[PDB]
Amino acid sequence: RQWALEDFEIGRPLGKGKFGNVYLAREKQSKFILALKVLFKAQLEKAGVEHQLRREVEIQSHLRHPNILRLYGYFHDATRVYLILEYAPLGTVYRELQKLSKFDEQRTATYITELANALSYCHSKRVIHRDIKPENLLLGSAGELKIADFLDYLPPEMIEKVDLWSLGVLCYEFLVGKPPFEANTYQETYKRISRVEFTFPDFVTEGARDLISRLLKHNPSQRPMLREVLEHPWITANSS
Numbered sequence: 021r022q023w024a025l026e027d028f029e030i031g032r033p034l035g036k037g038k039f040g041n042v043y044l045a046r047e048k049q050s051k052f053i054l055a056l057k058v059l060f061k062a063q064l065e066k067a068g069v070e071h072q073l074r075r076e077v078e079i080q081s082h083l084r085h086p087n088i089l090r091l092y093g094y095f096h097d098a099t100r101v102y103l104i105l106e107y108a109p110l111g112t113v114y115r116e117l118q119k120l121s122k123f124d125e126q127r128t129a130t131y132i133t134e135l136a137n138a139l140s141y142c143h144s145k146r147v148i149h150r151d152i153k154p155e156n157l158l159l160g161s162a163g164e165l166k167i168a169d170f171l172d173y174l175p176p177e178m179i180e181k182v183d184l185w186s187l188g189v190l191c192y193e194f195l196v197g198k199p200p201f202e203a204n205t206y207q208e209t210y211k212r213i214s215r216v217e218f219t220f221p222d223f224v225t226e227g228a229r230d231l232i233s234r235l236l237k238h239n240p241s242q243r244p245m246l247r248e249v250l251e252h253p254w255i256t257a258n259s260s
């Protein structure tokens with residue numbers, strides 16, 4: 021397939037992102053609704069990520085999972101790069117979280133389940149996802165989470181099995197409304213993650229504390245496998 025900008029009808033802006041604006045779009049060849057990101061060669065060059073982007077897209081093109089935001093393909097012209105992406109009608113988990121302040125245990129477990137299934141898919145094909153932020157987590161029409169990930173969220177080994185640490189930080193944030201190691205200073209945040217200093221408010225149930233505590237280990241090897249997250253009693257009791 022040899023894509024071009026002529027193949028799409030451009031609709032409303034969906035906001036700014038890292039290295040370009042994202043627009044609602046509709047492909048003339050199929051009438052199908054999607055999202056189009058516009059990037060700039062000069063901006064990608066000035067930083068030095070042009071080679072990292074070309075790799076990410078090649079990997080991203082070969083991933084078919086309902087909990088990963090689909091990259092249908094890509095193209096470029098003289099001065100721009102274009103990503104053809106699945107549109108997520110329900111927005112970000114980030115925005116939802118600040119709207120709702122926090123999530124109950126059914127919403128959290130269901131999300132973690134969805135994440136762990138997407139992270140399992142990627143494991144069975146030797147693809148590794150680093151840190152995962154709520155900003156990179158999008159929502160489809162049926163409310164299902166979709167990963168759009170091509171300090172507070174980084175494990176101790178990346179600042180001094182990364183998937184699992186991310187699952188633990190998110191599970192905490194979803195229920196509590198703030199990341200577990202957040203502090204007023206970058207140095208204080210550093211100390212928290214390195215020493216793994218988190219405390220639960222009174223309302224976090226014991227089953228959730230067991231999962232989070234097993235996920236937030238300093239030693240990467242002592243973190244559970246993704247199957248063990250999916251079979252955890254708290255997860256299966258609360259997931260839809």
Ligand SMILES: CNc1nccc(-c2cccnc2Oc2ccc(NC(=O)Nc3cccc(C(F)(F)F)c3)cc2C)n1
Binds near residue numbers: 042055057158
């Ligand atoms: C509302 N529904 C909806 N639906 C689909 C999209 C959006 C969307 C909207 C606004 C912004 N990003 C949006 O989606 C994204 C689109 C790509 C990316 N990833 C990305 O830009 N990665 C990226 C870039 C440069 C260099 C690099 C590199 F190579 F350096 F790592 C890696 C991440 C998001 C989150 N929104």
